[model samples]
Target: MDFDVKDFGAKGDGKSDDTEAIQAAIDAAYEAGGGTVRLSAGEYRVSGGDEASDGALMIKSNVYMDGAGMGETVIKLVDGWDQKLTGIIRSKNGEKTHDYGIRDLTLDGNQDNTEGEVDGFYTGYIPREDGADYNVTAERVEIREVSRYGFDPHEQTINLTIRDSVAHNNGKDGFVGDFQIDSTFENNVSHDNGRHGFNIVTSSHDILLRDNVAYGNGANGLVVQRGSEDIAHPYNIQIEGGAYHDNGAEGVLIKMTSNASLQGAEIYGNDAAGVRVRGVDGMQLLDNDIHDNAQGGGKAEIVLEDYDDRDGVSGNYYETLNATVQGNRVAGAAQLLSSEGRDLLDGAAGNDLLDGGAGRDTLSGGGGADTFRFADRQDSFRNYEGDTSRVDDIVDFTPGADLIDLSGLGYSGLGDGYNGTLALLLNEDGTKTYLKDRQADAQGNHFEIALDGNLVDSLSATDIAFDATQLELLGTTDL
Candidate 1:
């Protein structure tokens, strides 16, 4: 059944209060099972102070709103209410909405004259209720000038897909929500918001942000974070493709998450770090164009920070293990750092800086002359389990070309020198050798470096050129 709003007395003249007539037409369709509420090309003004429903238009299930076109058909809020308005949307019961669609329309929050913080198009589960499942879609919709987020369907929102939509100029983030499961946001543009372009909180998983464009936001372009300690950590989040640029902060910031990846993203011109990783277990930085982020604020192209004591769990961890950084074209020298996790930092075809902070990390300088920096003792220190000393590994290391920087260890020199010493032990079968440095090992006092991978060229100590005189600065102040 097709029900037009004009038939129920909606003037569509932009001056008349069209709330009652539009509700009448929507009620008529709801009473008749379900139907589309067709809106003509005009601005329908609505007074949104419904105390019972707590929404301007309490849309029901199986009901879809169809407009003439984005800017042609608009629904705006009429300011001058005693209290905060819930904006122009949601379900009648304020619980959850399913099988709902809004197409080709613009929602104006009128924040210039309005008072209060609310979303332009909002619907969220009422906490622990039977509103765990919802399937909603918005296409060709423009939502802006709101007191809060443009589209916020948080709290157990499942199977939500928003395609070809625009959300901008909001009081807070352009698109913000949490607890998203199996959701896909494709080809949407969110820009010029109060905070992040898209702030997806923790307790969300199986989400795909595909082909979106976010720029000029107040904060990071995209932030996936465990907002607080009470919330669950996010996992299995994937950023398939997008363009994030000119944000006030990092292009992408994922905090305390796992199984997160950045693939095929065109990102640049952020004020802070290009990508900041905080306390993650599994991550992949593959096939992304993240560059030019050193906008004089901070040259943190990629930073790994420690995340500790989250949700009562102990240990200083965050991307300390099971991480991969490869196949990305970054401007200047890319900085890849890791800690206390079995990670792979491969500077493929670039002169990158690989710094393994701690634990068993594998460093492979694929192309160009890369710098392997072991600034502190813990950086390459051994882990003694019962009595076994485990160390960091350097793969594809070309001697005389690749350099190891141990200047921060404060040692005078190596071997014959007073402060430092280097010991090399050829394997029993002569397949490899162990080079150990004891001066900078802050934990057990030193660490080991394994040479010979298929083993390195030959298995002899002379093959690696590991004499004390060969090291440019070994452990001196200005050697």
Candidate 2:
């Protein structure tokens, strides 16, 4: 069955208040079992007030809104941001909206005419309730210029797919929602929004954000954070191919999550870190080309704060930092030492090569047999120069399981055939090894290795591996 809004006295003249007319058409369609409410190629104006008749042109379950074309048929909200204004298109009843489809239309939330905080489109299971709006698909839609988000699926919206959509120039985030599960957002462009381009907070899980471009947003291009602690944590979220650049903050900021995967994203030229993860239990940064971030503060390309490393990281390229081959391929340099906050690096069950470039770094390679590499002469001191004691700690170094590599300082051989004129001195406790260039003064350039410090347990010459060969050095070197 089919019902056209024009048949119900909708003028489509761009000035008439078509609120009652559109609702009459929708009501007729609902009474006729299920039908398509077709909006002929023209402009439809809507009003706003604190009444049940005001606000969005409601779409009922199994009722599809079919338009002539996106620009050809436009639904413009005139005064929609007032106290009772909800959104441009929403379900009449908040507790139920299923099997809905919105195709080929442009929703313009005329925010300039609205009072405050109007949304373009919203649908869901109420504000604070627990229900599900499933089997919904929105395609070929252009939503813009709203006071809030363009598309918002509130509480427990599931099995939704939004594709080939454009959400741009909104007052708040382009597409903001919470409690969305098993949803996929693909081939969408969200740019120049007030907040994050796509902000999926709360317990939105099993979400696949694929091939979506988010750029020039006020905050992160795409951000996933807990709406509130102890409420919900986002998990099993995958961002599969996309471009995120020139954002005000990190391109992708994942906080308070577990089991998140970001793969094959071209995240570049962001103002802050490209990908910043805070308090994550398990994460995988796989085969993404992340570069040239820190455009604002020049921070690391990828910043991980309070990471426990329940998952492995591999197959990512950082253009600025020197590459360290790990697991399957060459990946970005992992900064174990946070200069300002004083954090440590923890590795997962992969063959990882941990490096402490500068400052006092710490390492704890869990499960896998890991290797630690240190550079710079300042590594000799237990504490950093001016700051608090930033002592590097090797938390758990299984003697046969892990090894240390110190070839960056040009030590070719060890033990009797030690190549470079360097002197080695094992401390009294047989745990610390002090090495200095024989020709240079003691204070010139010296290095120290603590095998049994605060976090370190034990180590021997056999537990050390150099770029130069000769493992027999363990039996020959003085302990």
Candidate 3:
């Protein structure tokens, strides 16, 4: 049923500090023993007098706490105060466990660091040990602009399932829950944080983190540390799906004692290793396109430390990793050595600078007249698997001084990044240079053309002037 907090005695506006009004509604709901007691869709200013033990309205028993939706309702935290623990819906004392359904809500911290007040509850590192018996079913929620972690379930081994949630612009992690079990986080976007986007460190088991996109954080995208030195280690962890892009440190750091399985995830455009796995056991990484990481001053993709260590990495397809590199084309600089210790390299496309580095590696030079440098000491170029995969029929390249020219191909619609992939058809005027890969199906070299020398003018973003003499544009739309 709908019981607006204003009807039960709340001011319903953000200015009046109507925390007591909201609390009364929660009290009534708990006393009724298992029903929803919602805060009306408005900005709520939680004052410093609020206690962590009884903060905001302690949610007890099986119930759902909802707002109008994250867009309309604002659970605002008091600014510039000493309330070092302000959870929106905390549990009652001695009642550390409960099942809750929360949706369409926002937990906003209005402190803004005014007067440099760092002792506030939202800014402090409060252990979220309140969910021992707490089960959260949350959806479409946005938790942001907070001092500490956006969601800190410290040491509370409660089960949680969070979906369609966003955690952004937080001082700490977007979601930080330790000591939890049977938890699943799906389709959540965590970005622009001071620490890792999502971190779990409390030995929680059977944790499934799937389809979560994380990037633009000061630290790692996803960091899973087992436990404190005094506590037991965590096992049975899994992270699958989604994109982890452009983080400060490792894309996914599974360190020390995290037994996990990560598969089908795209990790690229990061500062450090795509997937840094160390000191773990039985970790399986499969079907993940992990490349274009560890840019010079960073570590390797899979750094197997403590040799004869725990949980070796097996069954992963590290081939198809692109998109998220420093350059728009090449897959960064990574020298993978086979089991027998041979260099495995994929050359660059589009005007790249490459170093083969002292080994025999197959290199296929893609477009843009690239260069490949090699070390003089180790001159072994035998075990190279070469592939010259030119999508010739799709679009033909006419090399010039600065750019490749294209014309005479059928008009192909725009494909990726607002750039056209299909070729345009030539007119009856009969002067076209670039041809489709399938253009001259049966015709034997329809036209002869030369570069006509490079054009004198500069190329713009969309259009380029080409110096082309008509090559034979003769072909059926086959090939």
- RMSD, one per candidate, in order: 5.4, 12.4, 15.6
- Which portions of model 1 miss their true places by more than 4 Å? 79-82, 92-94, 128-130, 308-320, 348-352, 356-360, 365-370, 374-391, 396-402, 406-420, 423-447, 450-479
TM of each candidate vs. truth:
0.82, 0.68, 0.61
lDDT of each: 0.73, 0.68, 0.54
lDDT of 3 by residue, 1-479 (tens): 65567777776566677677777776677677767767667887765444544455455566666788876877776555455554555554445556665678887755474221111111111244343655767778888877667766545545688889888887878887676678888999999988888887866678889999999998889988754444555778788898887899888887654457777788887788777655554455556777677653553454333222233342222221111112123343232212112223332333332322232333333344433322221222211123322221212222331222233222232222112342333424443322222222242222111112222132221232221221113111111
Candidate maximizing lDDT: 1
Locate the minimum summed-lDDT window of 10 residues in model 1.
Answer: 470-479
Error of 3 at 8 (Å): 1.8
Give the TM-score comparing model 2 with the true structure, all chains together: 0.68
lDDT of 1 by residue, 274-380 (tens): 88887777888888887788575764466656576534543334454567887777664556777666677876454567776766777877666666777566656
Q: Where does model 2 exceed 4 Å of error?
A: 49-54, 79-81, 307-479
